[PDB]
Amino acid sequence: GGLLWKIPWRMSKFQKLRQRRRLRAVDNVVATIENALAKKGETVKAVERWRAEMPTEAEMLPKDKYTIFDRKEKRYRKGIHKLPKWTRVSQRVNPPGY
Amino acid sequence: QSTANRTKRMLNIPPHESFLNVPVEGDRIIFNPPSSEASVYHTPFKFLPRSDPRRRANIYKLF
Amino acid sequence: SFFRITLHRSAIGLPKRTHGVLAALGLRRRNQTVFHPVEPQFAGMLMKVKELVRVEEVPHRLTKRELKDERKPDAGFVVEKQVRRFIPGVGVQDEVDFSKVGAVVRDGKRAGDLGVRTRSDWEVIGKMKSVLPKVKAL
RNA sequence: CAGUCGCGUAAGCGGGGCAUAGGAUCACAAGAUACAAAAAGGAAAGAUCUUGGAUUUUUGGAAAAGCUACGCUAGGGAUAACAGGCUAAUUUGCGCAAGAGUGUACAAAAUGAGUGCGCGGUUUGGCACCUCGAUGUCGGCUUGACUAAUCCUCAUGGAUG
RNA sequence: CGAAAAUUUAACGGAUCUAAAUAAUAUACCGAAACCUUGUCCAUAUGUAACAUUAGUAAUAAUAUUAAUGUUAUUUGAUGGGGUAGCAGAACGUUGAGUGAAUCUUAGAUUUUUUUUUUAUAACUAAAUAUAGAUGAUAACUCAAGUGAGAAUGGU
RNA sequence: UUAUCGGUGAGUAUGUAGACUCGGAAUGACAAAGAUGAAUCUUGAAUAAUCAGACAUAGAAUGAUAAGGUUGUAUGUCAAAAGGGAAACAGCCCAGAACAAGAGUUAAGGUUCCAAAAUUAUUAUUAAGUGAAAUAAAGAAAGUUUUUAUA
RNA sequence: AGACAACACUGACUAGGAUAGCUGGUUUUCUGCGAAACCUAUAAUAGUAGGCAAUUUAAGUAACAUCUUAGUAGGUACAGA
RNA sequence: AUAAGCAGCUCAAGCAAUAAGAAAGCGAGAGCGUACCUUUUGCAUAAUGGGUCACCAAGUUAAUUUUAGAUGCGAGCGAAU
Ligand SMILES: [K+]
Ligand SMILES: [K+]
Ligand SMILES: [K+]
Ligand SMILES: [Mg+2]
Ligand SMILES: [Mg+2]
Ligand SMILES: [Mg+2]
Ligand SMILES: [Mg+2]
Ligand SMILES: [Mg+2]
Ligand SMILES: [Mg+2]
Ligand SMILES: [Mg+2]
Ligand SMILES: [Mg+2]
Ligand SMILES: [Mg+2]
Ligand SMILES: [Mg+2]
Ligand SMILES: [Mg+2]
Ligand SMILES: [Mg+2]
Ligand SMILES: [Mg+2]
Ligand SMILES: [Mg+2]
Ligand SMILES: [Mg+2]
Ligand SMILES: [Mg+2]
Ligand SMILES: [Mg+2]
Ligand SMILES: [Mg+2]
Ligand SMILES: [Mg+2]
Ligand SMILES: [Mg+2]
Ligand SMILES: [Mg+2]
Ligand SMILES: [Mg+2]
Ligand SMILES: [Mg+2]
Ligand SMILES: [Mg+2]
Ligand SMILES: [Mg+2]
Ligand SMILES: [Mg+2]
Ligand SMILES: [Mg+2]
Ligand SMILES: [Mg+2]
Ligand SMILES: [Mg+2]
Ligand SMILES: [Mg+2]
Ligand SMILES: [Mg+2]
Ligand SMILES: [Mg+2]
To answer: Using CA atoms, how far apart are residues A5 and A72, in angstroms rounded to an integer?
Structure first.
């Protein structure tokens, strides 16, 4: 190609700090909504699905926070900053073994 | 820059370190001798009349 | 309790369905605070925009006049003395000094009613040729 | 729903086919309708309903062959004659890895099948962002500048061969 | 190390860096016309009060009120604010016309300028130069258009 | 007579998949009730422009698993969107510009100097300026560190 | 020799009578809203028509959007043989 | 007269009134900013157009057929005696 989209393949230590803090901020929203309902003895299907199949920032591996699964990459991994609107989208789980 | 507001930010100089130690609780009077030339209205203690009652110790010796 | 939701991020590039979730919550612009009861209907509404908002449990809902009174800065001044002014719909309010406290507003169809010094008053002060200050005060 | 027929003990079923692959109007023609009838009585020519003949097959439905290098005008440059741009299938462009084999002996002095991993932008191509000096896209002359994958000159390792 | 191309270092932007590199973390700070706060302008509302105009209705020999329009303020501490094609609303300006046998002008009407002020495609203040009594200029409302030009290889 | 050739029967044996799907998501779709919301919907009357779109991400067809190629689908941006970041930048990352003021609060992104803000703390690796905002590959090797074994 | 017939000749000059789905241009300000490059038909694909649908402002709304809860249609990713 | 500005904008030293009062203008120096229009998916584009300025220069009129608003009359209206 000729149109230059200068996107580095890896993130900087400053972007990683904000990715860590963005994952840790979505945990407080799900922990606030999950505890607010438990006091009322209530539950939601989407709040129970999240806690089941999604990990917290303290349970994620570094490669799951800064990378995603791309079948067209050599090692099936791609920088998470390559995902559209990656800053306002949730992406924590990748296919097993990849 | 484009706007006057953008120029004020590029030309900013922070206040002195002394003013940035704001008290969390209550009011405190602090000693902040400035790094500047004193005027002629700061009469030295040697030029004050014996009658004058304002001849205090150095402010260093009041802390 | 209630959910205190504040739109921290925008949705300029997110799908159209995400705008329908922020429209039902009432978040029009950025950093706008809304209060919604703690209920499953709202809780699933926040699981769709949980990457843009900040949720907080609060005991009571805040009114419109109370959400704005927590960001209102102190005036930093107090009017202690006012000078004579003419209020169009009320009348001519005289001078008042709030240090010794009296907004007396005299209205009428004659200059005497307004409470101001008229030409006749200046003729009575000009004919008092006997008034003299005491020698001790002079 | 009305009309009136078939089958069935009855309930009931029947407005073709187990489902999915057959075009109007106009004109023209054959029946019915009793609407109007250019003075009037009739009629002609019209109107409604039913139906027929269509590679109406460019099947929402023209009776229809070419040339212009002498071409004209209005335009677009959907790339068309060029160059630049992207790509690298191919190449008369190369490198590296591996080593079947040749070398009387002995893989790597030399040589190197069919292959793998690559660089590069010269040949023949692909694309079409882009209208412009072209179909041998190139030759000669003048004058260069640069590259190094070296024909000559300079230094040098290997070579039972 | 493999890693070779033709203007020039030539895809760290550059200086430079032994971290000012890399990997796993933590905090403060900076940071947009975004957000907040204090004001302003504009659009659309909602009630109230007051001012003016017009037109009615009452009172008055010893002014009050109703409706429309314009306007300011204020209540809800009201809501809203990019924009091509395109659609819609509201205005200004230019030329001519009626009211006009009107108003104003040597105590300076009018002067392509300069200057001042006002939320201002506009008018206004003052100054300087010249000298007009109407074949001069003109508010307000209204009427009709040969009515608004940095763009047509436009024309003079 | 064959661990030869083909064929048949058996296998709860191994693989293969656009026209195999017994199993089977998420997503999206339809409709009901309640709640919330910025009127965003329908109708009546009046009446437009537009009909080569481009790129990005995912997943395909096509090409040669080439193209800033061609062609569907999902989502967004540009088109018609200024501002901050990506050195410069239609399409990417943030964020939707009515006008001002403020060491105001933040996003993306950054904080030695150019250039606003850390030469800020902790633990390791690298010695090649590797690298530091656009990863050249297979491969080689007493480079070096750690771990697991080991004399 | 498609040669010449008075600037012009693959049929001159002059006067009278055109069209152009194509190109270019279309002039003051403020305010509100705000698209599409898709489908169908077309001797049509540089056009046009009808839709979808932008605008104006009236009448309606059990309107429309989103979520929650229960239900329904349908066989992709995956997985399997 | 040491400098690589679509000549504007943001910051701004200094100069500038013989005199009481009164600073328009020019501006060193620092930063930001790649003309306009047309046509296009997209133009600083090396795509189209313009040497400058002034003037001329484009949704108008007629008939006809509609709609909205306002207003006259009203089961009549308009026209005309
Ligand atoms: K000839
Ligand atoms: K808008
Ligand atoms: K005109
Ligand atoms: Mg390029
Ligand atoms: Mg938008
Ligand atoms: Mg007859
Ligand atoms: Mg007859
Ligand atoms: Mg057809
Ligand atoms: Mg059809
Ligand atoms: Mg093209
Ligand atoms: Mg041998
Ligand atoms: Mg040699
Ligand atoms: Mg030798
Ligand atoms: Mg460099
Ligand atoms: Mg704003
Ligand atoms: Mg806005
Ligand atoms: Mg607007
Ligand atoms: Mg004058
Ligand atoms: Mg012109
Ligand atoms: Mg393309
Ligand atoms: Mg366009
Ligand atoms: Mg932009
Ligand atoms: Mg930088
Ligand atoms: Mg600060
Ligand atoms: Mg600094
Ligand atoms: Mg380097
Ligand atoms: Mg579109
Ligand atoms: Mg056409
Ligand atoms: Mg099944
Ligand atoms: Mg100099
Ligand atoms: Mg083009
Ligand atoms: Mg040029
Ligand atoms: Mg040009
Ligand atoms: Mg020109
Ligand atoms: Mg004109």
So the answer is: 19
A96 Cβ nearer than 7 Å to chain D strand: no
Distances (CA, A) of C13 to A86, A88, C8, C102: 11, 9, 15, 59
Helix extents (H) in C9-130: 16-25, 40-46, 64-67, 111-114, 119-127
**Where do runs of H (alpha helix) occur along A1-98?**
13-39, 45-53, 62-65
Alpha carbons A85 and C12: distance in angstroms, whole number = 10
Structural Rg of chain B based on CA atoms: 19
CB-based burial label for A56 (10 Å; 0-12, 13-18, 19+)? middle
Q: Chains contacting C with at least 3 CB pairs below 8 Å?
A: A
Structure determination technique employed: cryo-EM
Residue of A29, A36, A45 with shortest CB distance to C50: A29
Half-sphere exposure at residue A89, Cβ-oriented, CA atoms within 13 angstroms = 14
For residue C91, what are the β-bridge partners? C87
Determine the number of helices (DSSP H) and then strands (DSSP E) in chain C.
Answer: 5, 9
User: CA gyration radius for chain A?
Assistant: 16
Tell me the C-alpha distance between C7 and C23, whole Å: 11
Q: Token pair of C53, please?
A: 């908002």
